[PDB]
Amino acid sequence: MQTDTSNRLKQIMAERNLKQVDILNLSIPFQKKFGIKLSKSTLSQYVNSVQSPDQNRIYLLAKTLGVSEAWLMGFDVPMVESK
């Protein structure tokens, strides 16, 4: 069994009372440190199950939110310990 990245993002937003604006703004310092861009439009496509994140944007969002990258991809693993 597994889930998808859209469900994982929705779990984050329910656990921590976040909206997409919070996710995107929390990511800004990480986008600069890692050299990985994420736009408002792209993040909405991930939450609405229109596209899956590529390798670089999983890494960005897993570091931003402090969660396992395998978990954020939708595998049935622990939320925190990969990377």
Residue numbers in the entry: 1 to 81, 83 to 84
Task: Provide text from the study.
The TP901-1 switch is encoded by a < 1 kb fragment of the phage genome, including genes for the CI repressor and a Mor (modulator of repression) antirepressor (transcribed from the PR and PL promotors, respectively) instead of Cro. As for phage λ, CI in TP901-1 contains a DNA-binding, N-terminal domain (CI-NTD), which consists of a characteristic helix-turn-helix (HTH) structure. Cooperative binding of the TP901-1 CI dimer to OL ensures maintenance of the lysogenic, immune state, and inhibition of expression of lytic genes and mor. Structural evidence from a CI-NTD:Mor complex and a CI-NTD:DNA complex strongly suggests that it functions as an antirepressor by steric hindrance, preventing binding of CI-NTD monomers in a dimer to adjacent half-sites on OL.
However, none of the uncomplexed structures of CI-NTD corresponded to the identical sequence of the construct used for the interaction studies with Mor, which motivated a new crystallization effort. The new X-ray structure, which has by far the highest resolution for a TP901-1 CI-NTD structure obtained so far, resembles the overall previous structures of TP901-1 CI-NTD with the typical HTH motif. Generally, the structure is of high quality. It was determined at a maximum resolution of 1.29 Å with a final R factor of 14.97% and R free of 18.29%. However, several exposed side chains have alternate conformations (Met1, Ser6, Gln11, Ile12, Met13, Glu15, Ile23, Ser41, Ser44, Ile58, Glu69, Met73, Met79, and Val80) or are not fully visible in the electron density maps. However, there was definite disordered electron density beyond this point, which, after many attempts, was modeled as res 81 connected to the rest of the chain and two additional residues (83-84) after a one-residue gap. As modeled, the positions of res 81 and the res 83-84 segment are not compatible with each other, but each represents one of presumably multiple conformations assumed by the chain in this area. Gln55, Glu69, and Met73 (underlined in the sequences above) stand out as interface residues taking on different conformations in different crystal structures. In the most recent high-resolution structure, there are no such interactions and two conformations were necessary for adequate modeling of the side chain. An omit map where Glu69 was modeled as Ala clearly indicates that the Glu69 side chain density would clash with Phe67 of Mor in the complex; thus, a considerable rearrangement is required on complex formation. Instead, the most notable rearrangement upon complex formation is Glu69, which forms an unusual interaction with the aromatic ring of Phe67 in Mor through its aliphatic chain.
